């Protein structure tokens, strides 16, 4: 008495297998049967039902059928490697979201050539259309089987299962055999649309102190259509890994002699310079005097700063002539030293200093990542010294300045937050009243909404946070406007007010883009390595078909460089189409080709990064096109 999803029953005398119920309905359903779900329990198609229960046929159309497909593709990895590399040991071959992997102990690592040979050999094996034969085997026999095959890791997995398990499913793939809970496909004809993807590193028991393993990743789907959809996603996703883009475009690299510290190559530093020189104008137009302050400061200054407990274990320390110093992790006390040089009146405030300050923090090395998490960072840092009456106006100006910068970089989606007084805080409640209300009045005057964050502010004042979404919808905090009414008092900053009363000024720490290393990492992934013209490291490449045009090319290159454009000449003894394909892959916005005709007419043939042929053109008309698009 076997019940089906439609609520009906089919009678069966003598215990019947899942497949046999399928064949009873028809050859067609049988041909489509991958496995069955007896009372919600997934079982192999060859398993018999002896009692009566409710059945549900699982086919390739079910997410459960795709999973079983993925499980059996793992088994095929072992089948192929045991023929190719008979001395390696199979460990585990489980299913994951959208694929599978098999961890394998191999004395030597696996190369891409290994993958290719393995996938090919798998494809050969799947093409035989052989049945997977499940045999429920006693535990002693299973041990005897794997011991004869030299699979020492399978035997350790067997010695893990409790004594409650006295038999286990053995799945035979011709001469290969593997064990698992399953189920698995009844036949390899369901394994058509698979592919191996990456090869990587794993560990026995997932513990880093045991032997390392080769991890063979793969994916599998019901049809090649869905397989290719998955491949496009994987390609489009690697298209936004800044580490991969940094390597492919020769922008930067890190190495163990300086962990978390970036080596900017010429093209990467060109990108940096575009941003820093634009933010330097922001300093200029916002009323900041840019400064530069020492990086190595007496430990005594950091102990007075109010930040000693946060940074005492997060700074590089160094010694000279029996004095102890720290490499600076922040610019603010240096900026207070500048402010302290002169006598200031209330008349003189606000005074604003900006600095692209090279800072270091002794961050844990295991948490470092590309240029997004570093030990050495430069921010578009700045500090405003003002009276507390002026906080609001200063914050409205900064708000307007920050949005224009976000607008300039094509970040249109913003979210603004205010962090409020934390539990462990300093200063009068009345002073936190004035500072918090000043941040609220400022954002109101600018007609913006904001989310409030109870308890999330620094101990020395509230702050406004500027969060931006990038082209794939993920959120980053870029800007900060942090009120500080504590460090100025700690470090002797003061002015004279309306009646000769010496008072400490309020200090505002602020940044618009934050860490430049981080911001460049966000920009690289945001634009998917295809930078706008004003931002590309190499904007124009002037090439030459022949050696005759070489001198004319150099003349063109130096004219554009005098015009302030980032230009590079390609004068190599190389095929010109090869140069075209190579510079196109670098995503260079413009590629001027010079031949006999262009040198004689005084023109330049322009081909854009998209592939639009602009034809021939005067050199002056190309310069005009660049200034129009704000390059």
Structure tokens at 320: 């000279």
Q: Does residue 136 have a cis bond before it (omega within 30 degrees)?
A: no
Interacting residues of 398 by C-beta distance below 8 A, sequence separation 6+: 286, 384, 481, 508, 510
Contact present, 588 and 609 (Cβ < 8 Å): yes
Return the residue matching tokens 């100025």: 488
CB 482, min distance to Zn ion, A: 7
CB-side neighbour CA atoms (13 Å) of 24: 13
Burial of residue 617 (number of CB atoms within 10 Å: 0-12, 13-18, 19+): middle
Instruction: Select from 185, 332, 349, 486 the one that contacts Zn ion (CB under 5 A).
Output: 332
Least Å from the CB of residue 560 to Zn ion: 40
- Each residue 400-439 as x (binds Zn ion by CB under 5 A) or -, in order, gives ----------------------------------------
CA dist 201 and 211 (Å) reads: 10
Please check if 332 is assigned to a binding site: yes
Catalytic position from the list 44, 114, 380, 381:
381
Q: What stretch of H or E contains 352?
A: strand 351-360
Is 178 assigned a catalytic role? no
| Interface segment toward Zn ion; rule CB under 5 A; list 447-455, 504-512, 564-572, 616-624 | 504-512
Contact pattern from residue 509 through residue 548 relative to Zn ion, giving x for each residue in contact according to CB under 5 A and a dash for the rest: x---------------------------------------
Is position 408 annotated as part of the catalytic site?
Answer: no
User: Distance between CA 541 and CA 162 in Å, rounded?
Assistant: 68
Catalytic residue among 71, 173, 463, 587: 463
Alpha-carbon dihedral 508, 511, 514, 515, rounded to 10 degrees: -70
Q: Report whether 221 contacts 163 (CB < 8 A).
A: no
Is 224 one of the annotated active-site residues of the chain?
no
Residue closer to Zn ion, measured from CB, 219 or 401: 401
Q: Does the annotation flag 71 for ligand binding?
A: no
Segments in 253-390 forming alpha helices (H): 266-285, 299-304, 308-311, 332-341
Task: Find the part of the chain contacting Zn ion (CB under 5 A) among 141-149, 158-166, 330-338, 599-607.
Answer: 330-338
Shortest spacing between CB 316 and Zn ion, in angstroms: 19
CB of 332 to Zn ion, least distance (A): 3
Which span sits near Zn ion by CB under 5 A: 507-515, 516-524, 587-595, 598-606?
Answer: 507-515
Does 383 qualify as catalytic in the annotation? Answer: yes
What minimum distance in Å lies between the beta carbon of 364 and Zn ion?
Answer: 23
Contact 293, 335 (CB under 8 A): yes
Measured at the alpha carbon of residue 327, what is the angle toward residues 325 and 330, in degrees to the nearest 5? 120
Residues binding Zn ion: number (CB under 5 A): 2
Beta carbon nearer to Zn ion, 71 or 509: 509
| Binding region for Zn ion (CB under 5 A) out of 193-201, 232-240, 503-511, 600-608 | 503-511
Q: Which stretch binds Zn ion (CB under 5 A): 285-293, 305-313, 327-335, 413-421?
A: 327-335
- Residue 87 known to be catalytic: no
CB of 477: closest distance to Zn ion in angstroms?
16
Buried b (16+ CB within 10 A) or exposed e, 379-404: bbbbbbbbbbebbbebbbbbbebbbe
Q: Which is nearer to Zn ion, 216 or 326 (CB)?
A: 326
- Contact window for Zn ion (CB under 5 A) among 159-167, 300-308, 325-333, 429-437: 325-333
The string of DSSP codes covering 485-553 is: SSHHHHTT--EE-TTS-EEPPEEEEEESS-BHHHHHHHHHHHTTT---TTT-SS-EEEEESSSTTHHHH
* Mask for 278-317, x = binds Zn ion (CB under 5 A): ----------------------------------------
Among 352, 509, 527, 587, the active-site one is: 509
Comparing CB distances to Zn ion, the nearer of 245 and 332 is 332
Which one from 361, 434, 490, 503 is the annotated catalytic residue? Answer: 361
3-state secondary structure string, 27-89? HHHHHHCCEEEECCEEEECCCEECCCCECCEECCCCHHHHHHHHHHHHHHHHHHHHHHCCCCE
Backbone angles phi, psi at 110, to 5 degrees: -100, 135
Q: Which is nearer to Zn ion, 381 or 598 (CB)?
A: 381
Residue of 215, 383, 526, 583 with catalytic role: 383
383: annotated binding-site residue? Answer: yes
Query: Could you confirm whether 503 is annotated as catalytic?
Result: no
What's 302-338 look like in SS3? HHHCCCHHHHCCCCCEEEECCEEEEECCCCHHHHHHH
Q: Which of residues 436-475 bind Zn ion (CB under 5 A)?
A: none
Q: How far is the CB of 362 from Zn ion (least distance, A)?
A: 19
Q: Is 379 a catalytic residue?
A: yes
For residues 101 and 339, which CB has a smaller minimum distance to Zn ion in the complex? Answer: 339
Smallest separation (angstroms) from Zn ion to the CB of 520: 21
CA dist., res. 525 & res. 531, Å (int): 10
Instruction: Rounding to the nearest 10 degrees, give the CA dihedral for residues 226, 230, 233, 237.
Output: 170
Output the known binding site for Zn(2+).
Answer: 332, 383, 509
Catalytic residues: 332, 361, 379, 381, 383, 463, 509
Residues of the shown chain interacting with Zn ion in the complex, contacts defined by CB under 5 A: 332, 509
Output the known binding site.
Answer: 332, 383, 509
């Amino acid at each position: 008495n076997i019940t089906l999803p439609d609520g009906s029953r089919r009678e069966f005398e003598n215990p019947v297998s899942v497949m046999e119920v399928a064949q009873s309905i028809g050859a067609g359903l049988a041909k489509a049967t991958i496995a069955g779900a007896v009372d919600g329990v997934l079982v192999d198609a060859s398993d018999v039902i002896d009692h009566d229960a409710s059945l549900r046929i699982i086919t390739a159309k079910d997410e459960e059928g795709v999973e079983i497909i993925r499980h059996s593709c793992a088994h095929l990895v072992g089948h192929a490697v045991k023929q190719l590399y008979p001395d390696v040991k199979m460990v585990i071959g489980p299913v994951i979201a959208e694929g599978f992997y098999y961890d394998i102990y191999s004395e030597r690592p696996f190369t891409p050539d290994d993958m290719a040979a393995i996938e090919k050999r798998m494809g050969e094996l799947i093409a035989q259309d052989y049945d997977v034969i499940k045999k429920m085997t006693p535990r002693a026999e299973v041990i005897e089987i794997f011991k004869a095959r030299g699979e020492d890791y399978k035997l350790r997995l067997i010695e893990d299962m409790s004594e409650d398990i006295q038999a286990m499913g053995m799945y035979y793939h011709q001469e290969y055999v593997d064990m698992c809970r399953g189920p698995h496909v009844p036949n390899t004809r369901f394994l058509k649309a698979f592919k191996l993807t990456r090869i990587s590193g794993a560990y026995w028991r997932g513990d880093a102190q045991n032997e390392q393993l080769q991890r063979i990743y793969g994916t599998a789907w019901a049809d090649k259509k869905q397989l290719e959809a998955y491949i496009k996603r994987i390609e489009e996703a690697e298209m936004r890994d800044h580490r991969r883009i940094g390597k492919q475009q020769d922008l930067f690299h890190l190495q163990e002699e300086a962990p978390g510290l970036v080596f900017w190559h010429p093209k990467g530093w060109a990108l940096w310079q575009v941003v820093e020189q634009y933010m330097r104008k922001v300093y200029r137009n916002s009323g900041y005097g840019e400064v530069r302050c020492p990086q190595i400061l007496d430990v005594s200054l950091w102990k007075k700063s109010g930040h000693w407990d946060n940074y005492q274990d997060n700074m590089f320390f160094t010694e000279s002539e029996k004095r102890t110093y720290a490499v600076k992790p922040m610019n603010c006390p240096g900026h207070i030293q500048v402010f302290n040089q002169g006598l200031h009146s209330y008349r003189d405030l606000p005074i604003r200093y900006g600095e692209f300050g090279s800072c270091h923090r002794n961050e844990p090395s295991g948490a470092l990542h590309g240029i997004l998490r570093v030990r050495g960072f430069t921010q578009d840092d700045g500090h405003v010294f003002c009276t507390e009456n002026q906080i609001e106006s200063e914050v409205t100006a900064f708000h307007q300045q920050a949005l224009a910068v976000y607008q300039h970089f094509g970040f249109d989606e913003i979210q603004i937050k205010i962090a409020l007084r934390p539990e462990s805080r300093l200063g009068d409640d009345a002073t936190w009243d004035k500072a918090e209300g000043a941040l609220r009045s400022a954002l109101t005057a600018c007609g913006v909404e904001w989310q409030e964050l109870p308890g999330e502010g620094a101990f020395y004042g509230p702050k406004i946070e500027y969060h931006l979404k990038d082209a794939i919808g993920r959120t980053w905090q870029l800007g900060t406007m942090q009120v500080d009414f504590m460090m100025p008092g700690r470090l002797g900053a003061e002015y004279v007010d309306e009646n000769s009363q010496k008072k400490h000024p309020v200090m505002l720490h602020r940044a618009i883009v934050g860490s430049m290393e981080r911001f460049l990492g966000i920009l690289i992934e945001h634009h998917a390595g295809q930078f706008p013209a004003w931002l590309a490291p190499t904007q124009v490449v002037v090439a030459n078909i022949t050696d005759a045009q070489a001198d004319y090319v150099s003349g063109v290159t130096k004219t554009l460089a005098e015009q302030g454009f980032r230009v590079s000449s390609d004068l190599r003894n190389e095929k010109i189409g090869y140069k075209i394909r190579e510079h196109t892959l670098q995503r260079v916005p413009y590629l001027l080709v010079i031949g006999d005709r262009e040198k004689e007419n005084g023109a330049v043939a322009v081909r854009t990064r998209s592939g639009e042929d602009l034809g021939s053109m005067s050199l002056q008309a190309f310069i005009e096109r660049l200034h129009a698009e704000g390059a």
